[PDB]
A and B are shown apart, each in its own frame.
Chain A
Amino acid sequence: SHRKYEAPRHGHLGFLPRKRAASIRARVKAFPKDDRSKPVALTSFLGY
């Protein structure tokens, strides 16, 4: 049967599994797309 009333889902299903990360430093999965006209420069940096 139906629930009793409709209610929203608890939590986000895209952030699964909620496990411990493989390293203390998070990976950069994506980088900005290259533009051949621009000069050579870095895309990211590291800090604390």
Chain B
Amino acid sequence: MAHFKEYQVIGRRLPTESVPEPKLFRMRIFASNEVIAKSRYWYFLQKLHKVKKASGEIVSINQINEAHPTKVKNFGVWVRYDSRSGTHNMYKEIRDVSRVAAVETLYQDMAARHRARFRSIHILKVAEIEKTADVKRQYVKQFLTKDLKFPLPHRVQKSTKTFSYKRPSTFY
């Protein structure tokens, strides 16, 4: 929906006089700011426990940064999306540099190939793939080969002026 960030949100749902010290639930939220991270927190607790925003409160919200933001990783993403007719589960693999960048590619990929908007996508689990030969997708295994070299034919050199006095060349 915007440039994403990763947050952790903790619930408490309010301790009554009968039951003190509640279970202090927690999950991880991919959102743009702290406004939507709290909103998406209560969206999933109403799908798992007898709780709403009026019966609970937010304990702590913290932004989770990438441990190694300068390392290319292979991620396995499980999603639950709603199509025009029924709900289906899907597992996708994205090769990127960080957890928050793989989510950005996933939302653009799901909207382009399946016409699924942000409101119809559930992020079940994102996990780094530790070892090679576990990548079951063909569009990621191509970049894991030894000594990967490939050209970029037909360079489209963007110009600024409206009229050019030379015939352009697309060499590389």
Q: Do any CB atoms of chain A lie under 8 A from CB atoms of chain B in the complex? A: no
